[PDB]
């Protein structure tokens, strides 16, 4: 319930990796007691781009009872008070019919272009997106370096993205070219801000967000700068703890 909190009208959301935990490690004991004390005053929750099976590694096994809200895959999978609230996936949203046209088009497109180096894992299917690589994610470190230079000279990914946009003008997808070898395809607005529709029915006066990659291009950018949140940029769990202690007057 939301009955035993000094401010049942304030929610604090946390990016997981690098905000509640170190850069690639598990959560500290002081952070857990800090959250436990924070939960006494306000509603707390987390949001991360990975699934619940990756966040248990970072946050612990008893995660559904540690946070009032648990947002996995940017909120595609959501829990409230430890009960499932909603589940959504890319394939459920787009449907198999459209996804089969999309895959067949991409497979044909890749078979027709001229590449000097091909490897494998040209399409990686994920729960909230697909990733498309003309050379393939199985390229070695050096093959990825080489492809990046080839792609800068011949604009392979850019041209493929434009071909996809014109072939599927009504699919509602966003395309993001990033890194050395690939681009992301996902429904517009399926970033960390996705999770906020899940808390709307509580009509909080304030929604705080803490994240370590709020810069341009980071996966906290959209939700930090969202009008529904008060953003707090951090660089470590230590910053998170320092800010929490003063802001919510923890003892």
Q: What angle do CA 123, 46, 236 make, to 5 degrees?
A: 95
Residues 6+ apart with CB under 8 A from 213: 15, 18, 219, 220, 221
Active-site option among 7, 15, 114, 220: 15
Q: Which of 26, 96, 140, 247 binds its own copies (CB under 8 A)?
A: 96
Asked if 140 interacts with its own copies (CB under 8 A), we say no
> Is 231 a residue that touches its own copies (CB under 8 A)?
no
Q: Which stretch binds Cl ion (CB under 5 A): 60-68, 91-99, 109-117, 118-126?
A: 118-126
Distance (Å, rounded) from C-alpha 74 to C-alpha 51?
Answer: 9
**51 noted as active-site residue:** no
Contacting range for its own copies; rule: CB under 8 A; set: 23-31, 32-40, 148-156, 193-201 = 193-201
Task: Return the residues of window 190-219 that contact Mg ion according to CB under 5 A.
Answer: 212
Nearer to Mg ion, 138 or 235 (CB): 235
Using the minimum distance from each CB to Mg ion, give the nearer residue, 58 or 229: 229
Token representation of residue 216: 């341009």
Core vs surface per residue 129-162: b (16+ CB within 10 A) or e: bbbbbbbbbebeeebbebbeeebeeeebbeebbe
Rule CB under 8 A: is residue 227 a binding residue for its own copies? Answer: yes
Q: What tokens does 45 get?
A: 């929750």
CA dist., res. 89 & res. 51, Å (int): 11
In three-state secondary structure terms, 149 is helix
Examine the residue annotation and report whether 7 is marked as an active-site residue of this protein. no
Q: Which residues lie near its own copies (CB under 8 A)?
A: 84, 87, 89, 91-92, 94-98, 101, 165-166, 169-170, 172, 174, 187-190, 193-194, 197, 225-227
Active site residues: 15, 17
């Amino acid at each position: 319930s939301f009955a035993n909190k000094q401010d049942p009208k304030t929610l604090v959301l946390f990016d997981v990796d690098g905000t509640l935990t170190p850069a690639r490690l598990t959560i500290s004991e002081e952070m857990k007691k800090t959250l436990e004390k924070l939960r006494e005053k306000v509603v707390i929750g987390f949001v991360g781009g990975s699934d619940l099976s990756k966040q248990v590694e970072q946050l612990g096994p008893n995660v559904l009872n540690d946070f009032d809200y648990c947002f996995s895959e940017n909120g595609l999978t959501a829990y409230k008070l430890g009960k499932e609230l909603a589940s959504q996936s890319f394939i459920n949203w787009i449907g198999n019919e459209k996804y089969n046209k999309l895959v067949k088009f991409i497979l044909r497109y890749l078979s027709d272009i001229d590449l000097p180096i091909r490897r494998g894992t040209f399409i990686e299917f994920r729960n909230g997106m697909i990733n498309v690589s003309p050379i393939g994610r199985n390229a070695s470190t050096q093959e990825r370096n080489d492809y990046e230079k080839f792609d800068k000279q011949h604009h392979i990914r850019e041209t493929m993205v434009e071909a996809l946009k014109k072939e599927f003008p009504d699919f509602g997808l966003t395309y993001s070219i990033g890194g050395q070898i690939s681009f992301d395809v996902f429904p517009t607005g399926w970033d960390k801000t996705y999770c906020l529709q899940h808390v709307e029915d509580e009509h909080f006066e304030n929604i705080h967000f803490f994240g370590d990659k709020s810069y341009k291009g980071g996966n906290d950018y959209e939700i930090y700068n969202d009008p529904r949140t008060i953003g707090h940029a951090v660089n470590s769990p230590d910053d998170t703890i320092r800010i929490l202690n003063e802001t919510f007057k923890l003892q």
